Design a binder for this molecule. Sequence first.
Ligand SMILES: *C(=N)[C@H](C[C@@H]1CCNC1=O)NC(=O)[C@@H]1[C@@H]2[C@H](CN1C(=O)[C@@H](NS(C)(=O)=O)C(C)(C)C)C2(C)C
Ligand SMILES: *C(=N)[C@H](C[C@@H]1CCNC1=O)NC(=O)[C@@H]1[C@@H]2[C@H](CN1C(=O)[C@@H](NS(C)(=O)=O)C(C)(C)C)C2(C)C
Lengths: 299, 289
Amino acid sequence: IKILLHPSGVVERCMVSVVYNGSALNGIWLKNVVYCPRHVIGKFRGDQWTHMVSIADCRDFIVKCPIQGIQLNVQSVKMVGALLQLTVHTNNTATPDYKFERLQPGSSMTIACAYDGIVRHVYHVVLQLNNLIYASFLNGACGSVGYTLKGKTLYLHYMHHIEFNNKTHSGTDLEGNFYGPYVDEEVIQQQTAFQYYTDNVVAQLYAHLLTVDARPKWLAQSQISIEDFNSWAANNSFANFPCEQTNMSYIMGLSQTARVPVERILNTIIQLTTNRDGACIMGSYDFECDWTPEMVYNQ
Amino acid sequence: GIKILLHPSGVVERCMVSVVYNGSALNGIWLKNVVYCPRHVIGKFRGDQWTHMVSIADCRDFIVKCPIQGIQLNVQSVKMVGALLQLTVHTNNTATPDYKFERLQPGSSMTIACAYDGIVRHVYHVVLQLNNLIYASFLNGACGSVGYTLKGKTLYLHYMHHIEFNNKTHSGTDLEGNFYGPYVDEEVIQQQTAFQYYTDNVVAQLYAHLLTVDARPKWLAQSQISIEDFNSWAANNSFANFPCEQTNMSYIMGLSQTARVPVERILNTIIQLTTYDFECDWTPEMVYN
Ligand SMILES: *C(=N)[C@H](C[C@@H]1CCNC1=O)NC(=O)[C@@H]1[C@@H]2[C@H](CN1C(=O)[C@@H](NS(C)(=O)=O)C(C)(C)C)C2(C)C
Ligand SMILES: *C(=N)[C@H](C[C@@H]1CCNC1=O)NC(=O)[C@@H]1[C@@H]2[C@H](CN1C(=O)[C@@H](NS(C)(=O)=O)C(C)(C)C)C2(C)C
């Protein structure tokens, strides 16, 4: 039915603010380490970072965890990828069992968008095939993390770095490596041509059949084979179906509930490109990659 | 010296099993009570045919043997996960190590344990290319071979082999059942992602050359080029933006010091050299350590 976000409680208790000679962004504080974007110390390019971090004064890092009221102190500074690993005196007692998991495109995460070390908004996002997320950030939002939760463990996937004029956003995983070829420099950077995550677009139409209307007038009458669709997809900015073989279990499940084979869904996608004419599907006027098959099937 | 390093196959060898089904012979790996093998052992199917055709496959037809342990296994249930079959068998594998199913990012290296009839016959090294293919070596009956790495006591499975394409590229899934790239286990010609050089690895191999063979060869560029200037050239010349992996800069900057050649000269050498070639088989982590 709905777009589900993971509860932001564990992340709020670990957020901190990091300020360095005027530049201010967010960090996350797990055990005795604070992870924050490296450009808090300056807007350097290429291979300048190794030297500038090595001469960075640990005393110029003013770090405070506001929801815990305590102000931290940086003992050592280490660059790990495009992130800084500020080792601090105190161990965070709120640190959960966590894991640094890299996202593959087409997966979802909750964004805990923070300012001055406090979470202000949480929203849903899916890593696109251009390795960008379509999010919402203002100045000082860098260091905001994307995360998911399985049982007790906090699965951190993302830390925010860059906004690209088209309201796309880019960052690293928590290991410090970017998604895609983007880097933390204030320049125009070439972008991958947008391509739909077909598995998720299929999940959008199925979610519509399951909660809004089981027989919409735009639902195609005829089927198209997966193979015929994949031939059309290569010329129409749709990824090869299925993008992920594991999504087929969920997609076959949704077809059984909706009593609509995925061949009708794929053919509806082809027809919609020529005649959606403003149809609102699952509450959007777009093709949305926010609905993953797993979230639609499980809920 | 500096060599291409591979991981010992012994841990993989003791879990390899043969899987035969109605005259089709593949390999599989036996972890705990589950044998993981490619699903096309039951037949050549396309699209969404797989789910139904798997559900009608009688497990008595899955003849599974462990040749090194002398065991024959009896499959009890069959589950398709992604493009892989999960055959639950009665016996637990006493040789199951601590293992993890880790997905591989392009540019990384792994060791292939090339197997036939459930026996590892060859071991060799590959690097996942940016087109999401490995350039390996497989014959009929090698599907089920695994690519892996080791850290300590843990076996990190990354790859199970499925397909060979006309231009001697090979594609498969991870151990969770999802393919690398847009390729699928169907006997048709499939479009391939255009090739792109993993620049971090091309830089690692050139440094490896300056560290063992000829320090300062004559085809080294005399002048530096900017990282930023290289990346503008790279976008038009089939090289990935540098750095491919930000964590590789630690290794690469360390290589640049002992080689006493800045990375800006390596990059400008890469540009001048452009006249499977200039390979991406050396990762900076391997050369540096
Ligand atoms: C970190 N807090 C910000 C987040 C930005 C601010 C506006 N919306 C966001 O999401 N990141 C930056 O300020 C980042 C920093 C400097 C320039 N930069 C950008 O994202 C810029 N975009 S770009 C790469 O196209 O020039 C811009 C114009 C400030 C949004 C560096 C890359 C170091
Ligand atoms: C599994 N054991 C094989 C490995 C192959 C055999 C030759 N070298 C290899 O790496 N895989 C297959 O036989 C695989 C199976 C059938 C067709 N197929 C292929 O790899 C074929 N290539 S393709 C997709 O381009 O037609 C070929 C011609 C046999 C090499 C299916 C995809 C189900």
